[PDB]
Design a protein around this ligand. Structure first.
Ligand SMILES: O=C(O)C[C@@](O)(CF)CCOP(=O)(O)OP(=O)(O)O
Ligand SMILES: O=C(O)C[C@@](O)(CF)CCOP(=O)(O)OP(=O)(O)O
Lengths: 321, 328
C-alpha cells in the first residue's frame, strides 16, 4: 500500500488561458499569468492498493459524479503510465472553500492530486514535470504547483507546455484579492469560442503584448501598470465569448455593478482592478494597504457574506506530513 | 381638416429603421456627426405620425404625444430643436406638435428615428421649405442620428461626412430586394443610446477595434446588397452588431445591453440556420433581439421562436420600399 498527501492552492489568471491548441494533452493557444491564493485550497490524500478494482474518489466526504469519476479514471491512467504500474487508488479530497459560492477549482484539485501521487509513488518529480503532470488534468492546475506569480508557457508538446514560478522580490506579500460572490464549464465554453468565435483572432493578436507588459510591471512592482493590462486582458477574454457561434456570456448585471465599484475606488484614490473567469464572480486585485477601504466600498452595495478577501500565498504546492 | 388663413400646418408619417451596420459613437456631439457610416432597413410596420401647426399667436412650442402633454424637460428639448427649424426657415413662428408613435415603445423599440424624421418632414411641408431629401436627412439628423435614415425606404446609408453640410443619409436602390426581406422582433433602467455610445466612444478600450473593421463590414454588406446575397449580408451584419456590443464591454467601466434571454434568442437563430432556415440577428440599445430573414422563411422562423417565447413577444415587420410621406 502506497500513500501520500498534499495541499494545493487555487490560482487566478491575470493574463487568461482561454482556448486549447491541443485538447488531449491540454496545450494552450497562449501563455498565461496567474497569482496563487492563500485562502482557498484543496487537500488530497491518495492511497494505492493492490486490491482496488477501479479508482475511487471521495470529495468532501461524498462520491463524485459520472463525468468526474470518469475524468479521474482517465487521469489516473496517465499516472499509472508514468509510474509504470497498474495500481488503482482511493482518493480522498477536501476543498477549503466557501460552500456553494462557485469558487471550487480544477486548479487546486489537480495540482494537489499530481503532487500527492508524486509523493505516494515516490517519483521525485521536478516542479516542471509536476506542472506537466497537473496540466494533463486541467490546464490551470499547471500553475498551482507554484505560489505567488506564476506563468504557464504554452510550448508545443507534452514536454514543453508547463508553468514556472516568478520571483517578484516578495511583491506578492503586498497584494490581495477580494472576491465578490454572485452553467457552461470553462473547458466547453472555451472550446466553442476557440473553434467558432468571430473575435478569437483579435484575442490572439493582443495576448502576447499584454503578457509582456504584465511581466514587465511585475519586475518593477508597478501596481497600476499591471492592473490596467490584466483588466483589459480580462475583458477581452469575455469579448471572445460574445463572438462565439452562438454567443454566450459568463457575466450578469451584478458582475457589472461590482466592476463599476472598482472604477469608483480608483477615482477615490484606492487603486484596484478586476477580473472574471468562467462565472459572474468578480475578483478584485488590490494592495493590502487599501484592501479594507475597497472592501468597505463594496459593503455599501453587496452583502457582507458575499465579500471575501484572500492574500496571495508565496509558497507553492506542499506535501502534508 | 380646416385651417385658418394665417396658420401653416403639415403632417408626415415616417417609418422606423433598424441599423444592420451600426452607428455607435459621435465625432461631434452637438451637430450629431457619427464616427462612422451606417446602413439600415426601414420597417413597414412601425412608424410615427406627426402634425405640426405654426401660428403667429403661439408664444412657445407645444408638444402633444399620443394624446398627452409632455413634461417641461421634453418640452424644453423640443423647443431647442424647433429653433433649428426657425433658423432654417428664417422665421420666428412657434408650433403645436401633435405626434402619435405607432412603435412598440413600451416593448422597448426606439421611436427616435421615426419621430425626428416625421417632425422634419412635417415642418418642411408646413413651411413650404422645399427641402431636398438630402436636406431633410440633415435636419432629422440634428434631432437624432438614426433619424437621418428614416427619410428613406428599403436600404439606406448614412454617410458620416465631416460637418453639418456633409453628414446625411441616402436611399440605396436594391433592385427591389427589400421586398423579399423581413425582420422579426423578439421582445425581451436603460442607459440611453446617446449616453451609452458616448461613454464607449470616449473610454472604451475596444473602440479602436470597432473603428478598424467598420468600413470593411460596410463594403461587404453593400456588396452583399448589390448581389442580393442574403447569406453574405447576414453574416457580416451579425458580426458587426456583435462587435458594437463588444465595445461596450471595453468601456470604463463596462456595461452591456444584453440579458440571458437575448442570448437564448440568438441560439434559436443559429439553430434555424443549421436547419436550413437562414436568418441573422442584431441588437440595439437594449435586450431586444431583431432577426433579419427572407420573407418566405419568416413564418417558419417565427414558429421556432414561438416554441419558447410568448406569442405576444414575437412580432414581425416587412421592409417598406417608400420613404417618408406627408399625410392628412
Ligand atoms: O484559469 C485560466 O487561466 C482562465 C479560466 O479560469 C477562465 F475561465 C479558465 C480555466 O481553465 P480550466 O478550468 O483549467 O480548463 P481545462 O484546461 O479545460 O481544465
Ligand atoms: O441606429 C443605430 O445606428 C444603432 C443604435 O440604435 C444602437 F443602439 C444607435 C442609435 O442611436 P441614436 O438614438 O440615433 O442616437 P442619437 O444620435 O444620440 O439620437
Amino acid at each position: 500500500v502506497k500513500s501520500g498527501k498534499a495541499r494545493a492552492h487555487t490560482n487566478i489568471a491575470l493574463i487568461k488561458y482561454w482556448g486549447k491548441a491541443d485538447e488531449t494533452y491540454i496545450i494552450p493557444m497562449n501563455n498565461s499569468l496567474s497569482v496563487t491564493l492563500d485562502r482557498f485550497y484543496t487537500e488530497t490524500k491518495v492511497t494505492f492498493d493492490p486490491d482496488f478494482t477501479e479508482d475511487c474518489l471521495i470529495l468532501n466526504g461524498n462520491e463524485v459524479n459520472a463525468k468526474e469519476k470518469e475524468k479521474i479514471q482517465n487521469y489516473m491512467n496517465i499516472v499509472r503510465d508514468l509510474a509504470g504500474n497498474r495500481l488503482h487508488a482511493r482518493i480522498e479530497s477536501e476543498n477549503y472553500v466557501p460552500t456553494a459560492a462557485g469558487l471550487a477549482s480544477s486548479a487546486s484539485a489537480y495540482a494537489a492530486l499530481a503532487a500527492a501521487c508524486n509523493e505516494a509513488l515516490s517519483l521525485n518529480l521536478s516542479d516542471t514535470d509536476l506542472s506537466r503532470l497537473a496540466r494533463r488534468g486541467s490546464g490551470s492546475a499547471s500553475r498551482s504547483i507554484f505560489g505567488g506569480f506564476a506563468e504557464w508557457e504554452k510550448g508545443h508538446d507534452d514536454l514543453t507546455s508547463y508553468a514556472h514560478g516568478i520571483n517578484s522580490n516578495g511583491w506578492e506579500k503586498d497584494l490581495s484579492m477580494i472576491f465578490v460572490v454572485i452553467k457552461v464549464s470553462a473547458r466547453s465554453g472555451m472550446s466553442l469560442t476557440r473553434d467558432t468565435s468571430r473575435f478569437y483572432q483579435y484575442w490572439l493578436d493582443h495576448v502576447d503584448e499584454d503578457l509582456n507588459e504584465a511581466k514587465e510591471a511585475v519586475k518593477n512592482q508597478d501596481f497600476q501598470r499591471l492592473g490596467e493590462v490584466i483588466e483589459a486582458n480580462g475583458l477581452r477574454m469575455h469579448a471572445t465569448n460574445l463572438g462565439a457561434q452562438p454567443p454566450f456570456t459568463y457575466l450578469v448585471q451584478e458582475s457589472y455593478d461590482a466592476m463599476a465599484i472598482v472604477e469608483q475606488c480608483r477615482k477615490a484614490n484606492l487603486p484596484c482592478y478586476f477580473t472574471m473567469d468562467a462565472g459572474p464572480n468578480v475578483k478584485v486585485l488590490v494592495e493590502k494597504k487599501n484592501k479594507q477601504a475597497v472592501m468597505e466600498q463594496f459593503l455599501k452595495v453587496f452583502d457582507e457574506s458575499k465579500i471575501i478577501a484572500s492574500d496571495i500565498i508565496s509558497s507553492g504546492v506542499e506535501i502534508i506530513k
